[PDB]
From TrEMBL:
GO molecular function, one term: nucleotide binding
Keywords on record: Nucleotide-binding
Gene Ontology process terms (BP): L-threonine catabolic process
Alphabetical list of Pfam families matching this protein: Epimerase (PF01370)
Highest rank taxon of the organism: Archaea
Keyword Nucleotide-binding set for record: yes
Domain NAD-dependent epimerase/dehydratase, chain residue ranges per copy: 2-229
Residues annotated as binding NAD(+): 10-11, 32, 47-48, 71, 136, 140, 166
Species, as recorded: uncultured archaeon MedDCM-OCT-S05-C57
Name of this chain's protein: NAD dependent epimerase/dehydratase family
PANTHER family per the UniProt record, alphabetical: L-THREONINE 3-DEHYDROGENASE, L-THREONINE 3-DEHYDROGENASE, MITOCHONDRIAL
Family: Belongs to the NAD(P)-dependent epimerase/dehydratase family.
Length: 308
């Protein structure tokens, strides 16, 4: 059996489906804080910080693999640093201890947020110093370190990816730092108007969800002896600025974009532009398939459909 925490989030929504297709619908348990009505997969509600419920779920269900996507992201974390630490650090510790107890295999992601401006912004290498300027970033470095401790000291096969910004249509914008990319598609198609919350030159590493979900599954499938990294593989597809995305979208759809930055700018400004993921490409055969063209075709085709 396979458990997905944070199953209702941007990533979890699509990861559950992909795991159901790969393993069988019967092998996947979704978990998150609240049970939604008419949900399409077996669901166990849980606050990730609640170890006795979390324990019970893993005990009662015979979970052997956990994809741990529960998290407070960067923007929410700058606003509420206490909550961001509690969920991201203590939640992760609950997953780790439980994996040790039940001998589980784990996927515990990180983020390009581990990086600060003291290391290269272009093609950030795998092994640079990690000095993040965000609350979330700091939680992610601590998480990488916990995971690698569990690997070293307790022999837990835990694996992870430093996810870049992820673009999808199947989940609605979650108010997050990278979410200007998603919001721009939705508002372009729905109303022909978008107010972007970062400036027009804001440039981040980005990836279409299909590629990120595939990378996750591929990494989890790899022979353990092939991996030279565990919790924290850099992973890359695209890097583009907000105006470059506007221009790509405008080739399909008339829309007027206005730039009005807010506090999220100051998060995005402390992050790299692009990421060197050679270790992922080498160790376990990573290659993305969605460039900005193909991504924007999927996004616009599907958003148009939803707005008929």
């Amino acid at each position: 059996m396979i458990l997905v925490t944070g199953a209702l989030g941007q990533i979890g929504t699509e990861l559950v489906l992909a795991l159901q297709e790969k393993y069988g619908n019967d092998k996947i348990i979704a978990s998150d804080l609240k049970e939604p009505e008419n949900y399409h997969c077996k669901f166990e509600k849980c606050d990730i910080r609640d170890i006795e419920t979390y324990e019970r779920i893993n005990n009662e269900n015979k979970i052997e693999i956990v994809y741990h996507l529960a998290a407070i992201l960067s923007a929410a974390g700058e606003k509420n640093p206490e909550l961001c630490h509690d969920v991201n650090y203590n939640g992760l510790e609950n997953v780790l201890k439980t994996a040790k107890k039940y001998n589980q295999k784990l996927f515990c992601p990180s983020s390009i947020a581990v990086f600060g401006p003291d290391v290269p912004k272009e093609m950030t290498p795998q092994n640079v110093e990690l000095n993040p300027k965000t609350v979330y970033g700091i939680t992610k470095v601590k998480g990488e370190e916990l995971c690698d401790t569990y690997f070293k000291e307790h022999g837990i096969d835990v694996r992870g990816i430093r996810y870049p910004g992820l673009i999808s249509w199947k989940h609605k914008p979650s108010g997050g730092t990278t979410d200007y990319a998603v919001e721009m598609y939705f508002d372009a198609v729905e109303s022909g108007k978008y107010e972007c919350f970062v400036n027009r030159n804001t440039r981040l590493p980005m990836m279409f969800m299909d590629d990120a979900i595939r990378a996750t599954l591929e990494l989890m499938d790899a022979p353990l002896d092939s991996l030279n990294y565990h919790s924290n593989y850099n992973l890359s597809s695209m890097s583009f600025s907000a105006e470059e995305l506007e221009k790509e979208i405008s080739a399909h759809v008339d829309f007027n974009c206005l730039y009005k930055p807010d506090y999220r700018q100051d998060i995005a400004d402390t992050w790299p532009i692009s990421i060197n993921d050679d270790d992922a490409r080498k160790d376990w055969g990573w290659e993305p398939k969605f460039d900005i063209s193909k991504m924007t075709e999927e996004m616009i085709t599907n958003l148009r459909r939803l707005n008929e």
